[PDB]
Design a protein that fits this description.
Blueprint lengths: L11 E8 L2 E8 L10 E7 L13 H9 L3 E5 L11 H17 L6 E11 L1 H11 L18 E5 L34 E6 L7 H13 L4 E6 L15 H16 L7
Parallel strand pairs: 3-4, 3-5, 5-6, 6-7, 7-8
Antiparallel strand pairs: 1-2, 2-4
Bound molecules: sodium ion (NA).
Length: 264
């Protein structure tokens, strides 16, 4: 199914972070007619795997699709528990480093620094959400005057509640500090969420409750239920790629809606 290290044919490889003698890579898919002077939107995908495993190859098909639509699309590698001595808070710092790196290098990348989308599945969906709405947890030696906050998010059955407060050994902080749900506030970037109603790993009600309170704060937060679908339904190769195909179509219309992508 998925392998690590990933095989990423045609991708440009860039090291976005060096930490603990590990070089963390972005696998970059550029569109046709790309030039550094471009101001294209960008999307950074974070794979899932419980902050313990997974592979950047997971979102390789989606990268190819969005580069084919004119986007600078990339899949980030980030540290995980089965390979590195990290906790969830470290994964968050890596995901923020990736967004900060793309913004910092927006001119070399042909990217609009205000059109960077964070995206991910399950644990990497959590990380994407952290880069839009969870404060701090930044790499301490990076230039914090470059924002690590993404400008939109596309989430594939994300984990969004990590503390049972107001309602742990692997987190690296107090639970609330890594929990997107406990940071809902007005003025947040737009996002779309795909989630299965029969998800036994991340209960759908936790996401519906999230999106409800997100709309109350005035945020554009669309939850697309996939009736009877289970955790992971969206992945390439699952079912007959019906869910993979429709999530791409729904994500495409979301990016055109907010002005990041041109209509087909
Ligand atoms: Na290339």
């Amino acid at each position: 199914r998925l392998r690590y290290p990933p095989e990423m044919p045609g991708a440009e490889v860039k090291v976005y972070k060096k930490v603990d003698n590990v070089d963390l890579k972005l696998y970059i898919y550029k569109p046709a007619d790309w030039k550094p002077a471009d101001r294209r939107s960008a999307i950074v995908f974070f794979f899932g795997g419980g902050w313990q495993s997974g592979s950047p190859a997971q979102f390789r098909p989606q990268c190819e699709y969005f580069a084919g639509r004119g986007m600078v699309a990339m899949a980030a590698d980030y540290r995980v528990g089965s390979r590195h001595n990290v906790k969830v808070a470290d994964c968050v710092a890596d995901a923020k480093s990736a967004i900060r790196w793309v913004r910092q290098h927006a001119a070399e990348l042909g990217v609009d620094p205000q059109k960077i989308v964070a995206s991910g599945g399950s644990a990497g969906g959590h990380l994407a959400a952290c880069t839009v709405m969870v404060p701090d947890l930044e790499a301490p030696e990076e230039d914090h005057t470059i924002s690590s906050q993404a400008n939109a998010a596309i989430l594939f059955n994300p984990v969004l509640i990590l503390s049972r407060e107001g309602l742990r050994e692997r987190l690296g902080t107090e639970p609330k500090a890594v929990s997107p749900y406990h940071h809902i506030r007005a003025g947040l970037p737009p996002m779309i969420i795909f989630h299965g109603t029969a998800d036994n790993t991340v209960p759908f009600e936790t996401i519906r409750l999230f999106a409800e309170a997100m709309k109350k704060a005035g945020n554009r937060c669309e939850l697309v239920p996939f009736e009877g679908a289970a955790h992971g339904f969206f992945n390439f190769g699952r079912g007959d790629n019906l869910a993979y195909q429709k999530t791409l179509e729904l994500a495409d219309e979301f990016l055109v809606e907010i002005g990041f992508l041109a209509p087909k």
